[PDB]
Amino acid sequence: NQEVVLSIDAIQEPEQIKFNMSLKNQSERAIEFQFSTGQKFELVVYDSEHKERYRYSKEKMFTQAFQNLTLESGETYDFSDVWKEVPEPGTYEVKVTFKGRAENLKQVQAVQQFEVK
């Protein structure tokens, strides 16, 4: 029913937490996304008081380059990130937002609860 779908998988590792994402074109048509900088996504890890614990974007510099990307019918754009410190046990939420903009598409974002144990 939705043309594009973003999935998030959060996996607790020994030294860190890993986030695997896949932006999937489920439509029958190719879809173009445009970006105004090199940055492809944003990822933010919220705690139970909605304070930010991690932001992919902090500590990074992106080129001010326009980009033009086509996701074919069925194609996925796969991407991941590592949060380099396990926090304390509890439930958290990761919100990934895709920075590419498709004509006649709401911006693509997903959220995902995950427990650190």
Numbering used by the authors: 3 to 119
Extract from the study:
The structure of IPI is a variant of the all-beta, immunoglobulin (Ig) fold. It is possible that IPI is important for protein-protein interactions, of which inhibition of Isp1 is one. IPI homologues are found in both bacteria and archaea, but no homologues have been detected in eukaryotes.
Bacillus subtilis was determined to 2.6 Å resolution by the MAD method. 29 shows that 98.0% of the residues are in favoured regions, with no outliers. Two residues, Lys 86 and Glu 87, are flagged as having unusual Ramachandran plot properties by the PDB validation report although not with Molprobity. Electron density for them strongly supports their modelled conformations. The structure has an unusual Ig-like fold. Remarkably, we find that the region at the edge of the IPI wedge structure could interact with subtilisin in a manner strongly reminiscent of inhibition modes of other subtilisin family inhibitors. This implies that IPI is not closely related to the I42 family, and that the similar folds may have been acquired independently by convergent evolution.
